[PDB]
Symmetry: C3
Subunit: 403 residues, 3 copies
C-alpha cells in the first residue's frame, strides 16, 4: 500500500496456510496474523516501532479474538458507522434502506470463552505504550434473549494490563455488553467517540492517573455504567454528552483529585452521578443535569432499582466542590418513589468539608435541592436553594439560602 | 489504492463516457458518479456499509451539487487549507506568495438553483446515519459585489433530512454565505473545525438532541450567525473560540436544557449571545465574553443594527443559570448607541426564575452589569456587581451586591 | 500511492543524486527534497494548495533540519508512539520488550547550528497559513549529559514567522528541550497531543490571537514551561491534563482577555500557574489544582527554586476572575520553604480589581488561601476560605469569608 512493511491493509493480507480466510470471513484471524508478521520483523527491544492496520469501509465478521501485545499498534478505519439497532429492533422496518451499522464495520462474533473482540494485554515489561484505536465500528450485532436485554457477554476493546498513552478516538461502539474497558490506565485519552446502545460504555478499572475522557457521545443500558472510574487520580471528564439509559451516567469509586466539568447529563433514573466509597477532593462543576422519565415504550417500565431519595448526585467522601451546575428534574408524580416523597437532587451521603455552591434547581414537584446525611461534617451549602429546599440532618452544616 | 471497492481516490476516479470530467474540472460530478457506483454495488439494506472518498491536497472546482443519500459516507481530505480571503481582498498583495485557500481545496462554484456544494438528504427511512466530513476545505471563492458583503448564495454542507451520529471535524470553511447547516440533528458532533469569513458558520435548524459543538474556531459576518440552534435539547457548546463579526456569536431560539461552558466569545456588536423565544433551563457558565469595537478599517462603519442596551447576553426565557463568566467591555463613547447610554452587559428581557451569579464585569464607561425587565419574575442576582450596576424594573428580584 | 503529485510517502521518495539517503538514514533530507519538488510544481500564488507528507510507522533518523516554508503542508504519521524514556533511564530495564518510543518515530539528531527538527519559517508574505502536524512522534533520544537534565538544545517544531490556522493534533513529543514553539500564532489549535518528558512543552511566543490549546496531556522539566503564552489575546486553554514537573504548568506574560477553564493541574513546586507582567481581564475558573511533592526518586531533591509563599497561582495584573477552582495542597512540613511558613494558594502579587470567588482549598498544614500584596488595589475575596485564611497586606480588599 505504502513503501513500508509497517502498513497493513486487512483487505490485501493473505494468511499463509489459510489462503481462503478474508477480512470479511474472519478479520480477527487476519489481524492476529498481521501482529505475528510485525513480531517476526520487529525482533529486538530497539527495533519495535509498531505498525498501522487499515480497515477500509465494509462488513467484516470477527470470530477470533485479536490479542494486541505490541507497543505503538494503530488500528484505524475511515468511519465510526453508528446505527440505532435499538430503534431498528423495536419498530416496523418495512421499506428501511439500511438495517445495520456500517463504516469500517466489525461484527463481533467471538466465542463465549474469548468474548472480547480486541484483548490488549502483555505479560512482562514495560507497560504497553502508545496503542491507537480510531475511526472504526465495533458492533455486537444482537442482544439475547431479545434486543432489549443489553446482554450478550461481548466486549469491544479490553485493555487488561498496565498501559501508558493509549488513544481511543473517532470510534463507534454499538450493541456490545461492554464497549471499552481500560485497567491500570496512565495518560489515557478516550476522545470524540460514539459509544451508545451498549450495556456498559467506558470502564476505567483497577486504578489510573493523568487520564482525559472528552467530547464523547455515550448511552448505556439500565444494568450498566456509562462512565465508570475505579481508584483514578487526576481523571478529567469534560465536553461529554451522556444520555440514557445506564444505571448511572458517571460512577466514581475511590476516585480522588479528579474533575468532572463542562458535561451534559441526561438520565431516566435516580443516581445519574455516583461518587462512592470515599471520593475525596474532586471538582464537580459547570455540568448540566436533566433527570426525566423514559419515553421509548419498550423500556417505559425499566428501573435501576434506586428511589428518588438516592440523589441525581450521590456523594460519599471528603472536600468535593459541587458548584455552578444546573439540575432540571421533571418526573410524573406517579413515577416518583417512594410515593409522595420529595426527590433529592444532591445527596451528601457522608464525608467532611464538602462545598455545594451556586447550583440552580428546577423541578416539576417540591424537591430538596440538597440533603446532607447526619454523618456529614463541616459541610457548606451556598446559593443552591432557599432554606425550605435544604435538609441538613448534620448539625454543623453552614447554609446560605439563595436570597 | 487499497484492496476494497469502498475506497475512492477522487483524482483516480474516471466517469466512463466523460473522460474530461476530473476532480479538477468538477469534483461534484466525480463524487456523484462515485455515489452512483456505491449504490450499484451496495444494493440491499444489509450490504450498505458505505465508503470513503479521499481528496488529496490540490485545487478542485465543484460546479455540480453533490447529493449525499447513503449512510456511512466519509468524505476526507488531508488539510483544512484556511486562508484569510478577507485580509487578501482589503490590503496590497504585491509580492504575496499565496492569494487563495489550499489543502484539500474545493472551490464552490455551484449554480444559483442548486447552491449547496453538498446536499445531505434522503426521502425515506431510516434517518441518514454516521456520515463523516473531515480534513478538507470548502471555499466559496468570492463575496459579491465585493469581498466585504458576506453574500454569494453558496452553502458548504446542508443536511436537509433527519440524521443520527454525523461527524464534522478538521474542516476548513471560508467565503461561503452558509458554511454548515444541519436540520434535525441527533447525536451530531461539530468538532475541531475552522469556520471563518463565512456569512453564517453553523446553523442547527428545525430541532435536535444530544449534540456537541466543541473545539471550533468560528468567525461569521454582520448579517449572519456564528452558532445558531433552533429548538435543540441537550446541546453542549464547549471549548469553542468565537471571534467577530457575526450579528451574534451564540443564538438559541426555543432551546431548552442546553449548556454553553468553557468558551471564548469576542464580538464588535451588542447581542453577542441571544437566548430568544422562551429558552428554558440552560447553563451559561465559565465563559469569557469580550465586547470590543471593529479595528479592521474596511468594516469600521458596519453594525448589526442593535444598541448597547440590547445586552452582551440577551435572555428571554425561564430558569437559566448565567454564572461564573467574565465580561470585558471596551467601546469608545463615540461608538456607543444611543449616544451617552450606559451599556447593559446581561439583559433579562423576560421570564421566570433566572439566576445571575458570580459574574465579573470590566467596562471603560459606566455600565449596568445586569438589567431585569419589568416582566421578569423570581430573578436572583448574586455577586455580579455593586448595587449601582444592577437595575431590576421587576419588584420581586433578590439582589446581593458584590461586597 | 494516490493519483495526485501532492501526496508523498517518505519511504518511497528518492533524492536524485543522493541514492543512499533513505527516510531511515535522514528523513530531514528526504522531507526537504519533497518540499523542493512541491515548490518546483507549485510556482504561482493561485497554484499553491500544498501537499501531504505521509510517515509510515518506523524508526527514522533526522540529521538535517526541515524548513517548512509552504502553506497547507500536512506532515502526518499513524501514531504518537509515546514511551517514558524518563522511567527507562532510571530503572533496571533487564528483560524489557521495548526501550524507545515508536509509531511514526522521528529520532531528532539535529546539530547545534540548526537544532529545531522542523523550522516553520517564511521571510516574505503573507503569513504561513493552514500547516498541519499530526499523528507522529518527535523524540530527542537523550538529555545531556544524562536523562534527568531536561537539556539537549533540540526543538521538535519551531514556528518562527507569523502564522494563521496552524493545526497540531495527535502528536507525541518526548525528550526534547523544546517540544513545540509557535511565534505570532493566529487561530492556532494545539489539540489532543501527548507532550511529555520535554524541558519545555508548548511555547506560544511574541504575541497571538484567537488560539485554542485543548485536550492535551503535558508534563515538562523543572527549569522549563509546560504551557507558556506571551502577549496572547483571546487564548482559550481548556480540557488539558497538566502534570509535573515543569517550573510551571501554565505561565502567561502580558496575556489579556484569555480563559483558562476546565483543566487538571498537578505540580510538585510552587508557581504551578503564573499570570506575569500585567495579565488583565483573564478568566481562571473550573480548574482542579493539586500541589504535591516529588515521588520519583531521581528527582526528589530537584526544585524550581521558588518558596511556598510564591502561590499555587501567582497573579500580577488587573481585573482577573479567579473563581470556582479546587486546590488540594499536600506537602510534608519538612519540604515547605521557608521553614514553618504558611503556604500561599493564591498570591495577588499586584494589580487592580482582581476577584477571587467560590474556591475550595484543602491543605495538610495551615495555609493562606489568598494573600494580597500591599500594592493590590480594589481586590474582592468571596467564599474562598474563613477570614483567618485571607491575608490582605493591601488596606482596600473587600472580604466575605465562607459562612
Ligand atoms: O494504574 C495507574 C498506573 O500505576 C502503575 C504504577 O505506576 O500501576 C499500579 C497498579 O496498582 C494500583 O492499584 C491497585 C488496585 O487498586 C492497588 O492494589 C495498588 O496499591 C495501586 O498502586 O495499577 C494497576 C490497576 O489496578 C495495577 O495493575 C497496578 O498494580 C502503572 O503500572 C499503571 O499504569
Ligand atoms: O434515550 C436514549 C437511549 O434510547 C435510544 C433507543 O433505545 O435512543 C432514543 C433517542 O432519543 C429518543 O427517545 C425516543 C425514542 O425514539 C424519542 O421519542 C425521543 O424524541 C428521542 O429523544 O436517543 C437519541 C437522542 O438522545 C436519539 O437519536 C434517539 O431517537 C438509545 O440510542 C439511547 O441510548
Ligand atoms: O475580527 C475578526 C475578523 O476579522 C478578520 C478579517 O476580516 O480577521 C482579521 C484579524 O486581523 C486584522 O484586524 C485586526 C484588528 O481587528 C488588526 O490588528 C490586524 O492588523 C488585521 O490584519 O482580526 C483578528 C483580530 O486581531 C485577527 O485574528 C485577524 O487576523 C476575519 O478573519 C475575522 O472573522
Ligand atoms: O501574533 C498575532 C498576529 O498579529 C500580527 C498582525 O495581525 O502580527 C503582529 C506581531 O506583533 C505584535 O507583537 C509584537 C511583539 O510583542 C509587538 O511589538 C507588536 O506591536 C504586536 O503587533 O506579532 C508577531 C509576534 O510578536 C510579530 O512578528 C508581529 O509583528 C500577525 O502577523 C500575527 O499572526
Ligand atoms: O510526575 C510526572 C512526571 O514524571 C514522569 C517520569 O519522569 O512520570 C511518572 C508518571 O507517574 C508517577 O510518579 C511515580 C513514578 O512512576 C509513581 O509512583 C506515581 O504513581 C505516578 O504519578 O507520570 C505519569 C502520570 O502522571 C505516569 O504514567 C508515570 O509513571 C514523567 O513522565 C512526568 O512528566
Ligand atoms: O513575590 C512573592 C515572593 O517574594 C518573597 C520575597 O522574596 O516574598 C515577599 C512577600 O512580601 C513582601 O511583599 C509585599 C510588598 O510588595 C508586602 O506585603 C510585604 O510587606 C513585603 O515584605 O510577598 C508576599 C506579599 O506579596 C508575602 O507573602 C511575602 O512575604 C518570597 O518569599 C515569595 O515567594
Amino acid at each position: 500500500p505504502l513503501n513500508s512493511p509497517n502498513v497493513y491493509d486487512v483487505t490485501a493480507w493473505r494468511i499463509k496456510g489459510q489462503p481462503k480466510v478474508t477480512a470479511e470471513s474472519d478479520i480477527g484471524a487476519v489481524i492476529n496474523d498481521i501482529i505475528a508478521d510485525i513480531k517476526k520483523r520487529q525482533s529486538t527491544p530497539e527495533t519495535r516501532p509498531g505498525a498501522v492496520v487499515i480497515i477500509p469501509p465494509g462488513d467484516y465478521d470477527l470470530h477470533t479474538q485479536v490479542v494486541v501485545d505490541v507497543d505503538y499498534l494503530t488500528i484505524a478505519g475511515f468511519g465510526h458507522g453508528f446505527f440505532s439497532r435499538s430503534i431498528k429492533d423495536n419498530v416496523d422496518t418495512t421499506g428501511w434502506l439500511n438495517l445495520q451499522p456500517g463504516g469500517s464495520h466489525i461484527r463481533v462474533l467471538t466465542p463465549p470463552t474469548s468474548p472480547q473482540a480486541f484483548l490488549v494485554r502483555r505479560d512482562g515489561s514495560p507497560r504497553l505504550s502508545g496503542i491507537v484505536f480510531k475511526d472504526f465500528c465495533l458492533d455486537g450485532v444482537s442482544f439475547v434473549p431479545d434486543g432489549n436485554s443489553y446482554k450478550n457477554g461481548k466486549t469491544g476493546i479490553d485493555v487488561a494490563s498496565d498501559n501508558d498513552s493509549i488513544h481511543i478516538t473517532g470510534m463507534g461502539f454499538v450493541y456490545l455488553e461492554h464497549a471499552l474497558i481500560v485497567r491500570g490506565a496512565d495518560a489515557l485519552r478516550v476522545h470524540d467517540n460514539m459509544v451508545a446502545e451498549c450495556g456498559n460504555c467506558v470502564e476505567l478499572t483497577g486504578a489510573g492517573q493523568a487520564t482525559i475522557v472528552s467530547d464523547n457521545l455515550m448511552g448505556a443500558g439500565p444494568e450498566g455504567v456509562t462512565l465508570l472510574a475505579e481508584n483514578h487520580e487526576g481523571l478529567l471528564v469534560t465536553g461529554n454528552n451522556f444520555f440514557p439509559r445506564g444505571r448511572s451516567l458517571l460512577e466514581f469509586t475511590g476516585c480522588n483529585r479528579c474533575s468532572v466539568t463542562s458535561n451534559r447529563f441526561q438520565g431516566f433514573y435516580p443516581g445519574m452521578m455516583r461518587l462512592l466509597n470515599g471520593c475525596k477532593e474532586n471538582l464537580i462543576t459547570s455540568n448540566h443535569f436533566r433527570r426525566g422519565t423514559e419515553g421509548f415504550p419498550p423500556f417505559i417500565d425499566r428501573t435501576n432499582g434506586l428511589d428518588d431519595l438516592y440523589g441525581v448526585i450521590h456523594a460519599m467522601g471528603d472536600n468535593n466542590l459541587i458548584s455552578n451546575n444546573l439540575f432540571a428534574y421533571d418526573v410524573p408524580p406517579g413515577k416518583i418513589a417512594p410515593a409522595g416523597a420529595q426527590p433529592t437532587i444532591m445527596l451528601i451521603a457522608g464525608g467532611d468539608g464538602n462545598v455545594i455552591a451556586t447550583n440552580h434547581v428546577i423541578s416539576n414537584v417540591d424537591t430538596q435541592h440538597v440533603v446532607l446525611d447526619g454523618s456529614a461534617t463541616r459541610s457548606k451549602v451556598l446559593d443552591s436553594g432557599a432554606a425550605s429546599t435544604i435538609t441538613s440532618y448534620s448539625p454543623d452544616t453552614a447554609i446560605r439560602p439563595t436570597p
